[PDB]
Design a protein around this ligand. Structure first.
Ligand SMILES: *[C@@H]1O[C@H](CO)[C@@H](O[C@@H]2O[C@H](CO)[C@@H](O)[C@H](O)[C@H]2NC(C)=O)[C@H](O)[C@H]1NC(C)=O
Ligand SMILES: *[C@@H]1O[C@H](CO)[C@@H](O)[C@H](O)[C@H]1NC(C)=O
Ligand SMILES: *[C@@H]1O[C@H](CO)[C@@H](O)[C@H](O)[C@H]1NC(C)=O
Ligand SMILES: *[C@@H]1O[C@H](CO)[C@@H](O)[C@H](O)[C@H]1NC(C)=O
Ligand SMILES: *[C@@H]1O[C@H](CO)[C@@H](O)[C@H](O)[C@H]1NC(C)=O
Ligand SMILES: *[C@@H]1O[C@H](CO)[C@@H](O)[C@H](O)[C@H]1NC(C)=O
Ligand SMILES: *[C@@H]1O[C@H](CO)[C@@H](O)[C@H](O)[C@H]1NC(C)=O
Ligand SMILES: [Cl-]
Ligand SMILES: [Cl-]
Ligand SMILES: [Zn+2]
Lengths: 197, 596
């Protein structure tokens, strides 16, 4: 109604979450200004599906969900509907019917250091693809061979989480990108997230 | 659960773990080649050891997946490449000792300085101090000093290191089921398991020697013409039947006769095609040189250089603050990091060198989408050849007019073609015997056919016979003149530059045909021809996922190395040299020496 939506704490947080454990924050009962969210730079991307971004400043929604995580530059294309890859299949999955926006920007000045920043992780192996908006934070030994693993990281038995190596001299495709996925939902309840208008 | 699915999963873990370990090794190696300190040698060996140890444990694990149960070809190729048990079959002491020898020779080459007998505190490095002398001096004694003092003060230091370097390298190769280290290097051209395209390691020596016979006529007439023009510059020092003095060629070793143009121009009254004077007159710098080469690759459809390239590359000598390896090299560090290390001067030789090293980066960026184990050249010859097929067009007077290094009213006649073809032959044809003779010496040293006392005896017996070059001062076994060259003291293979030259004209014949060029091959400029760049890019993107024999046929139509495009390129100059040598002797005597 009168309060302001805390989009600052989502887009401009000090440290983001790994893609395999992606963070979700519910936005409700507030007024949102979508023209001021992030710093638009040469590399930032703003991809909306099923909703016009030039109009949602005049739109109202029941609730808004903001999913934030850090992903390699080459893999930012995977945060879309109908995509495959290690990120879309195992870490984060948008449904083929997605009605929202995907905002991403380069963060090589924040999430990369001279020795290499290995605090961001991603899932490399999984026995099945993720359902849309499913999250998997399980550390369990992946069984690639026919023999069981029983929690042992030996041979054909791999630890599922690998580490992103973020160096400042990496190529654009290997540089860290911060991504925020906005989901705008409409229910039988009255709307609570409107723009200034 | 199946062997193939276990291999795909195993390779997935390898690719994501080797990406960062290889990049850390490349970073530490870059901090040494640009900044030569003992501290940087420590970190280079550390990141290198952790990469070699990772390869050994992953190669051992890769052998537990039998290839006989892999229907997938690209997976079978990655496992096959990973199962080769590397340079870590030595003991810990011998591996750390071998790398110490390599590290010691590399520092000696790039930091070793000679001091003139007059001033004990005024010394000259090989770059820029002796390279400037060997390239711009016309005094016989000044060139004789720099040529000899470099091989006597620095070359003698490398002799005991190189002897132990041969012993350890053979042990590493013989532990790899190779007969010697020379056979190990020839394995880069080896192809097995492909019907109609298999190439053996011994087949390279046959094809190199057979193709070289078809090059001797063009070289012997170029040799006789240069020897005649050199007599007019060094009257009392050169014999019209003797070999050429090694210290009178364009550079320290005689690798390229490029700097001998000003002394061997056929028609000097015509506008000079050497753009070196024009580059200095227009106030060009190393930035402008690479930006122009960057613009040339874009004209054919290839991408700009990455933003990290312009920020992380070292395109000029850093000065006396930090000692660097000034030899022009290109770097594929991994994770999309591409750099070039070159102490660029404002000369045309460095202008074409920029096109050479950028050809590597352009080739690296092409197959970057391939899996990690397939991010390499089809063979070592392909890699050093990409930059040279661009230099063929970038050196033509037509392209030099468009960029503004020749006059806008320049003309193409009787005597500008011979001027251009002569310069191209000094660089391209001159290095063919120098390269073949140098690699054949190492092939025989590694094989054991040359004992340690005749090293310098057989080295100059082959210089006189094969290259037609004689030493100005007699050298005994205390000298190590092969090690005085970069590629020998820095553990690189040299036959890559022989196949490079023959490949670059087979490619140029196919690219000029795609550009619908009409006329001779030497007047072809593939500038602004996306059809030419596309035919080349379709081969660069494949990496080494396909054999070099098949990858070469898909572009030029030949399964093997060939000499016909090379001779066809220089045919207008070949008939002109045969007429200019009617009053000269074609050949050389292996007995004449400028000393007693
Ligand atoms: C051989 O191996 C590669 C690697 O698995 C195969 O490329 C795969 O192709 C399918 C569909 O094109 C994808 O689902 C896989 O994910 C691809 N690989 C990767 C790494 O994602 C190739 O198609 C295989 N098959 C044959 C017949 O060669
Ligand atoms: C986040 O910071 C950028 C600049 O760093 C700013 O433009 C943007 O408005 C901030 N986001 C919000 C929601 O205020
Ligand atoms: C927003 O982005 C541009 C590019 O980095 C820069 O000019 C500006 O300072 C940024 N603002 C802040 C507050 O980070
Ligand atoms: C070269 O390396 C030394 C340490 O070996 C370091 O102190 C110095 O800053 C380096 N030089 C440059 C230009 O980075
Ligand atoms: C490549 O970069 C140069 C920078 O000098 C620029 O002029 C050119 O437009 C770029 N090429 C493309 C295709 O963007
Ligand atoms: C120059 O042209 C004339 C005819 O105009 C020809 O006879 C002569 O051989 C040519 N010389 C060269 C070096 O091509
Ligand atoms: C190639 O194209 C560029 C711009 O597209 C132009 O400036 C240049 O003059 C052209 N060169 C030739 C030889 O046509
Ligand atoms: Cl996209
Ligand atoms: Cl992928
Ligand atoms: Zn080179």
């Amino acid at each position: 109604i009168t309060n302001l939506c805390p989009f600052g704490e989502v887009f401009n947080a000090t440290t983001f979450a790994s893609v395999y454990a992606w963070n979700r924050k519910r936005i409700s009962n507030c007024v949102a200004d979508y023209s001021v969210l992030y710093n638009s730079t040469s590399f930032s991307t703003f991809k909306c599906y099923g909703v016009s971004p030039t109009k949602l400043n005049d739109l109202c929604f029941t609730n808004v969900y903001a999913d934030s995580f850090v992903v390699r530059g080459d893999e930012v294309r995977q945060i879309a509907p109908g995509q495959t890859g290690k990120i879309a299949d195992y870490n984060y999955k948008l449904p083929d019917d997605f009605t929202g926006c995907v905002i991403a920007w380069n963060s090589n000045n924040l999430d990369s250091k001279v020795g290499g920043n290995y605090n961001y992780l991603y899932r490399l192996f999984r026995k099945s693809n993720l359902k849309p908006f499913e999250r998997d934070i399980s550390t369990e030994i992946y069984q690639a061979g026919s023999t069981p693993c029983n929690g042992v990281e030996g041979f054909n038995c791999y630890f599922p989480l690998k580490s992103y190596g973020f160096h400042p001299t990496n190529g654009v495709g290997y540089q860290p990108y911060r991504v925020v996925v906005l989901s705008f939902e409409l229910l039988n309840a009255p709307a609570t997230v409107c723009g200034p208008k | 659960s199946t062997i193939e699915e276990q291999a795909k999963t195993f390779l997935d873990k390898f690719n994501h773990e080797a990406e960062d370990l290889f990049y850390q090794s490349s970073l530490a190696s870059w901090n040494y080649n640009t900044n030569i300190t003992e501290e940087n040698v420590q970190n280079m060996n550390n990141a290198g050891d952790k990469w070699s140890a990772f390869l050994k444990e992953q190669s051992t694990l890769a052998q537990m997946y039998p290839l006989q149960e892999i229907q997938n070809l690209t997976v079978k190729l990655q496992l096959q490449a990973l199962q080769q048990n590397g340079s870590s079959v030595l003991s810990e002491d011998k591996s750390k000792r071998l790398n110490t020898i390599l590290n010691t020779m590399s520092t000696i080459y790039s930091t070793g300085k000679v001091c003139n007998p007059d001033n004990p505190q005024e010394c000259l490095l090989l770059e820029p101090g002796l390279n400037e002398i060997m390239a711009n001096s016309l005094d016989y004694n000044e060139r004789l000093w720099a040529w000899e003092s470099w091989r006597s003060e620095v070359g003698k230091q490398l002799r005991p290191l190189y002897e132990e370097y041969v012993v350890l390298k053979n042990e590493m190769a013989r532990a790899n089921h190779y007969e010697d280290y020379g056979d190990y290097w020839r394995g880069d051209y080896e192809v097995n398991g492909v019907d109609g395209y298999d190439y053996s390691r011994g087949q390279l020596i046959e094809d190199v020697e057979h193709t070289f016979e078809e090059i001797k006529p063009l070289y012997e007439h170029l040799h006789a013409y240069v020897r005649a023009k050199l007599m007019n510059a060094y009257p009392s020092y050169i014999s019209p039947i003797g070999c050429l003095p090694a210290h009178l060629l364009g550079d320290m070793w005689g690798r390229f006769w490029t700097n001998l143009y000003s002394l061997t121009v056929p028609f000097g009254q015509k506008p000079n095609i050497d753009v070196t004077d024009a580059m200095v007159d227009q106030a060009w710098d190393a930035q402008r040189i690479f930006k122009e080469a960057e613009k040339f690759f874009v004209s054919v459809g290839l991408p700009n250089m990455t933003q990290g390239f312009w920020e992380n590359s070292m395109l000029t000598d850093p000065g006396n603050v930090q000692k660097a390896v000034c030899h022009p090299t290109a770097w594929d560090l991994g994770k999309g990091d591409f750099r070039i290390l070159m102490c660029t001067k404002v000369t045309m030789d460095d202008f074409l060198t920029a096109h050479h090293e950028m050809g590597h980066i352009q080739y690296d960026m092409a197959y970057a989408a391939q899996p990690f184990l397939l991010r390499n050249g089809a063979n070592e010859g392909f890699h050093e050849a990409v930059g040279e097929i661009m230099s063929l067009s970038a050196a033509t007077p037509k392209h030099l007019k468009s960029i503004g290094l020749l006059s806008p009213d320049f003309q193409e006649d009787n005597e500008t073609e011979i001027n251009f073809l002569l310069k191209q032959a000094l660089t391209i044809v001159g290095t063919l015997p120098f390269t073949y003779m140098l690699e054949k010496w190492r092939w025989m040293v590694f094989k054991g056919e040359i004992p340690k006392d005749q090293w310098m005896k057989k080295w100059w017996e082959m210089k006189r016979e094969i290259v037609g070059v004689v030493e100005p001062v007699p050298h005994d076994e205390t000298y190590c003149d092969p090690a005085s060259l970069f590629h020998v003291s820095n553990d690189y293979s040299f036959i890559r530059y022989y196949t490079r030259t023959l490949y670059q004209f087979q490619f140029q014949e196919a690219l000029c045909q795609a550009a619908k060029h009409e006329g001779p091959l030497h007047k072809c400029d593939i500038s602004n021809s996306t059809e030419a760049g596309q035919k080349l890019f379709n081969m660069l993107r494949l990496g080494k996922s396909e054999p070099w024999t098949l990858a070469l046929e898909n572009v030029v139509g030949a399964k093997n190395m060939n000499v016909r495009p090379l001779l066809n390129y220089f045919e207008p100059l070949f008939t002109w040299l045969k007429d200019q040598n009617k009053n000269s002797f074609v050949g050389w005597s292996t007995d004449w020496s400028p000393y007693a």
